Amino acid sequence: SSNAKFDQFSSDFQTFNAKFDQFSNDFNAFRSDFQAFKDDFARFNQRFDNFATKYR
């Protein structure tokens, strides 16, 4: 192909690489959010077990 056409594609690919990098960071922020929920659920589970034992 012409250099001009290839350069358009390579810079387009660079935009995609940047978008993917952002999505990867977004996904990891979601993972952090999910871990925070999981730990909050663990705290609930322990509080429940405590209550259910005392009120069994």
Place this chain on the structure above:
Amino acid sequence: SSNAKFDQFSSDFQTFNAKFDQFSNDFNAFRSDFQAFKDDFARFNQRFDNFATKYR
């Protein structure tokens, strides 16, 4: 390779790049929904703690 073939692929790539932006947007909408659920759960956990601690 040749121009006509390359131009077609460059177009196909750009269509994929646009679809990737829409997926990234879909994932962020999901992240907001998930955070909403996580905070709703956090609210529930605090109400459960109040019931179990302050009223039992």
Place this chain on the structure above:
Amino acid sequence: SSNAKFDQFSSDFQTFNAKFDQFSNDFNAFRSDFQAFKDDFARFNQRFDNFATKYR
């Protein structure tokens, strides 16, 4: 480069593009499942709220 090897790459990219579309659909189907769950969690939280108020 060889037109014929480029033809293979173009086809393999089309295959990737279709698989990406399948994944994007699957992700959006997952979002619908997450929405059903989030709604179900709301059902529970609101039921618990009522219960707690009556048993405070």
Place this chain on the structure above:
Amino acid sequence: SSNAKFDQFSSDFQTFNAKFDQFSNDFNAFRSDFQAFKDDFARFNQRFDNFATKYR
């Protein structure tokens, strides 16, 4: 480009295509885990409702 550079790229793309397919299968496996969880939650929700009803 030269055929050698292109052919290396095409081989690298085929490897990425295979990894993407793997990820899409991983994502679909997750969707099964999520649906199983959603169903477990709907069953908890019914059992909570039954408890709250019988305990009026």
Place this chain on the structure above:
Amino acid sequence: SSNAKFDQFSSDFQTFNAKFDQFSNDFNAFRSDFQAFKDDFARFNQRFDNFATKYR
């Protein structure tokens, strides 16, 4: 098009490929977090069943 420009694209694609492998690992780690959460929920569900049974 030129070998120099192709070499730059090939480098960018290799970097994307590596990022994708990282993301796929991150997704698998999330899947593991999710399964552990699902099992935690099942453990709660059993605790709640045992508690509710004793209030009949």
